[PDB]
Design a protein around this ligand. Sequence first.
Ligand SMILES: C1=C(CCNCc2ccccc2)CCCC1
Ligand SMILES: [Mg+2]
Lengths: 45, 214, 777, 238
Amino acid sequence: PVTQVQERICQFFTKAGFTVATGPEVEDDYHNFEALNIDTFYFDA
Amino acid sequence: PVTQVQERICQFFTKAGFTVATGPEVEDDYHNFEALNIPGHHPARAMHDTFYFDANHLLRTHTSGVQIRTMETSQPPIRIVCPGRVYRCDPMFHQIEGLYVAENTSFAELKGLLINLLNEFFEKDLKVRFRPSYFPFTEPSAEVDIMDERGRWLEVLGCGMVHPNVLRAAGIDPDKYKGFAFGLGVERFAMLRYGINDLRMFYQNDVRFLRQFA
Amino acid sequence: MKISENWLRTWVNPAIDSDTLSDQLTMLGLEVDELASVAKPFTGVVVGEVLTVEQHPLRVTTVNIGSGEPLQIVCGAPNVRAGMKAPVATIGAVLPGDFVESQGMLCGASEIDLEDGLLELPADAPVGVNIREYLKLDDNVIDISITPNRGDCFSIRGIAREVAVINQLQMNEPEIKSVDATITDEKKVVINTDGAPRYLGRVIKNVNVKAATPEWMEQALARSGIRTHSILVDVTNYVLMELGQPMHAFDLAKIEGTVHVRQAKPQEKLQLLNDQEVELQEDVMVIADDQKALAIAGIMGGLASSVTDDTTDIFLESAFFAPLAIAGRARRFGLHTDSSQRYERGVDFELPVIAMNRASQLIQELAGGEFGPITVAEKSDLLPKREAIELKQAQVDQLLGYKVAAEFITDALTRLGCEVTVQANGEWSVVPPSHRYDMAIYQDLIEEVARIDGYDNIQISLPSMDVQLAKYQDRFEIAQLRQTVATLGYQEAISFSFADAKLEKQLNPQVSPLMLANPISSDLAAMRSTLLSSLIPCVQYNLNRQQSRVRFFELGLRFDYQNANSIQDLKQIPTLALVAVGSREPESWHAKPQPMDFFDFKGEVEEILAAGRVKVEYVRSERPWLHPGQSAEILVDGQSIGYLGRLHPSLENELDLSTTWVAELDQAAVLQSYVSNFTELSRFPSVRRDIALLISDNINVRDIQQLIEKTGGELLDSTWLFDVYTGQGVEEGKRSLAFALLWQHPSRTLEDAEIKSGMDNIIQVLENTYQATLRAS
Amino acid sequence: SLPSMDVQLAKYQDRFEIAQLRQTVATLGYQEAISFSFADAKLEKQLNPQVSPLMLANPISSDLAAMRSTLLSSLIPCVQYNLNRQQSRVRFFELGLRFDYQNANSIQDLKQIPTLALVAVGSREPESWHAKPQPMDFFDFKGEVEEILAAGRVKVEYVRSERPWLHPGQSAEILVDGQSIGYLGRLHPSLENELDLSTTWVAELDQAAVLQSYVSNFTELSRFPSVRRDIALLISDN
Ligand SMILES: C1=C(CCNCc2ccccc2)CCCC1
Ligand SMILES: [Mg+2]
């Protein structure tokens, strides 16, 4: 179900010039917090 | 392969604002001629190479009826591409005809959109040539070539800026709205893309030929 | 249109190569389809003068090529020799299909790519000069392709104006000298119609109709595709190709009374110059007198008024005919003449007087006669209006997307023959010339600017739009249907929308096929009432090429014309078809190849319907092209959306096919929109129960299932048949069915009292409804 | 108001789209599952006893503490969820990020590979009157994996896999140009009994290998009939 909802929300934008962008789910502190003017599953520091 | 090339050309416009439109293949005379700034007995008729049944009912020579009905019911902005099979006495082939009508467009925007359409379809850095030609529904009208084969110029699509009478006949003010259009034969693109030389194989449907595109 | 390049360069010589000259025309909207020399290249050969012959019937002769000793050539040419000036190959091998010791052959009229064998030259025999230079064989023939909007470019005068504008030259228009009137025996011309607002007629007496044909006029017409006939028709054909105004000469001794240009009488008879007799209508213009009719106005003359070898007096016509009064009339009688096509696209209406002077001066030079005054029948204010066209510099900027210099805009329009006056400041008033029939609105003028300035100078830009999320409802997409059917093992076919009427009647003998009025062949004449009429030939195509297994699917249109009283009652509905011949799976080591049964094919169609959330019910189909026992009609809400089943074995054998499986479905029902609603799931286990039936053979399993699910109640979750037995212990006419019954309660565990109460209720209903014996495992 | 932008046709090469992959796997009878990216470290050790999984620093529970090195460590609990609720036949597929962390000296050496998982227990097709329900064999499962690969124009050679959680005699390694892109085969029967799973069929495939681009090239077709010949070899089974 969330896949169908996901593909419905995205098709509104993909058909209108937007493009889908994916990436890794294990992130660093810069791309997830520091670059955004700033209970989280962490691994190291 | 014809449907694959058809989907490849449409997806460029589909995910860029255009909506795919379709319509009937057996048309009448107004939506196929009189609404395209053709007075009637004009030399742009050629009743020989157009399949017909009565005198006001014929097979499509181009997917113009869908673009006509879209302009008569809907109001600009209009951004559609019209694929589908058409017929002529030579006999069945597909061609995609786009239509764009907004508050303002120009010949400069038509040339750019067509150039990166040809560049991104064939996935090459093509040398394109714009020649002037005539179509009753466009002014200025053009025909685009690409340097295919060995330095040869091969026609791939015709285009032009929608004639004011075509917009005015459908209920669109030609002073408040501008528009362009184009039309490319799908079998032309499919042969240049896949290296096919006899388009009779497209409809003989030899399973060995179809399997080559799998 | 074909024109000799040398003839064109007498009007304007841009001092560039012949390749660039055609590329200029092609880039100006006049695409050159071919530029080749008049004759193919060969080695330097010279037309020689024969000196003597030596009899011996072949024939040995001596030819003088104007160099040294006369050569000895033996040939069997039966033409006039021994003193003739004929072509002859000195030595070599250069002919397109060819190559006193015999040294060469007296060259023939043919085999030179431009053509009695061994035609001698007329006179003026050159001594040693190459024949390609004497006959101008190295000239080029440019094959122009003119669109119907450039009616002026159908002549040398029209092409030369284009080459002169792109090269910024001025045309060398040959100064025409008028012929003064010596006699006064003119005719009367009356215009009864409005399609001829300018008619010019001149009478010329005592003309030599049987002798002239100069070499320069013969080649100029031949290289344009026009052969020679008489002399007056050659003169009128030359002035047609030179200036663009067609003309025709009549036999004055066969015109009785006043010359009338009128509309033809209803079914008025007339025999044309091609010996063809046509009955006209009140729609086609005609050139008539006070009794009969002489010629179809501007298309073709009549056989009566034609200038024959017994003609002495001649009446020359040079009129302008309106294009809207000629278009279509020529094709109506199966005619496509040089005069008809030029009149349809538009002839310069200021040319009759100019073309009259040209043909007259040409006639007086090549023939004799007393020229009378030119009778001018002109209805002004009916001529083509060339009103001024407003044109702003802001219009060309917005319509082209880039800015062209105002100097170029005024200059480009002026060279094309426009009277542009700079009104006020920055705005123009452009008056189109008399020969241009494609200038009316300001869009026509801006295209002229882009034509002359250059289509390669169109700057690149992109259109802008507002990104707005369009409406979209969840549905079975067409791209997702192709993927599902392809996973089931079917290849996409695209068959013609028209098929053979014989196969269309073989499938359904009570069909009312929509047939073409001009079919391309007998097998492509009727629009397909079913996709099978066009897919079966493709299936047979592969079978005739060693293909045991072929599985097709097509997403096209069928044309339902049954019970239709008119053509607008036609229903063009999009359908999905399936055709399968051979084994279900390709040949492998798992099983010997065997064709599908009804349940192999039903399992595939069920999944296609299941892929689109389509709930269906199956009933027996009545299609004539189907096996009556193994055919199914697919019903949604009681109405049929398609069918599936085996092809009729008699029809299956008439087409030389194996076990074929066909199916068709309406795309509107398969590619449907859907919405799913969440229902709660129970936390409590289910209870499985079995039911074994012994029921009559003619009771459908679905009817039993929906009766069990009905009398079962809310507690019954699902039912599904899991076994069918028809072997030992079953009386012939019955069968053993085994149903599985899944019981579920939403909020608690099911008690054994409820289930047995439900099972006893179900077995009691099935025992009384169908007279069946049951069990409860 | 509404934002404005230029109509620019973006670069696109013909490929096997993710949506067309779902439609194929769903046509083959698999339901899309979405399980947690972290699973139990003990089940991760049962599948591969030589695994070094990436462990969370503050997991909410012990069964959600190890980033899945394979999608089986999270799909198997979902299969056991249904099997324990009177479900004889459950078929799953997921897309599908696994976390390769073995032979890594630092967390920056972690590999996050989007994969396509397949888990099937029970009969191939649902219970009907055509035959008694029986679970699939290796070639039923390979016939489904071969079609998913063929749907992306992927040319593949098969070789025996040596993964610990697999039946060594009925498990393939899927190689393209010599390098592996995944596996297919049944679970090791010992693991089936430890997990109470009857007979399961598992497979994993890199999405980059399945959702690959392709290009078709036309070749001429002979116009004269072919010849069919048969050869019957008696060769050793090895
Ligand atoms: C255009 C059309 C005509 C249909 N054909 C498209 C085409 C356009 C230009 C050149 C070649 C082909 C429908 C109404 C609006 C303007
Ligand atoms: Mg024009």
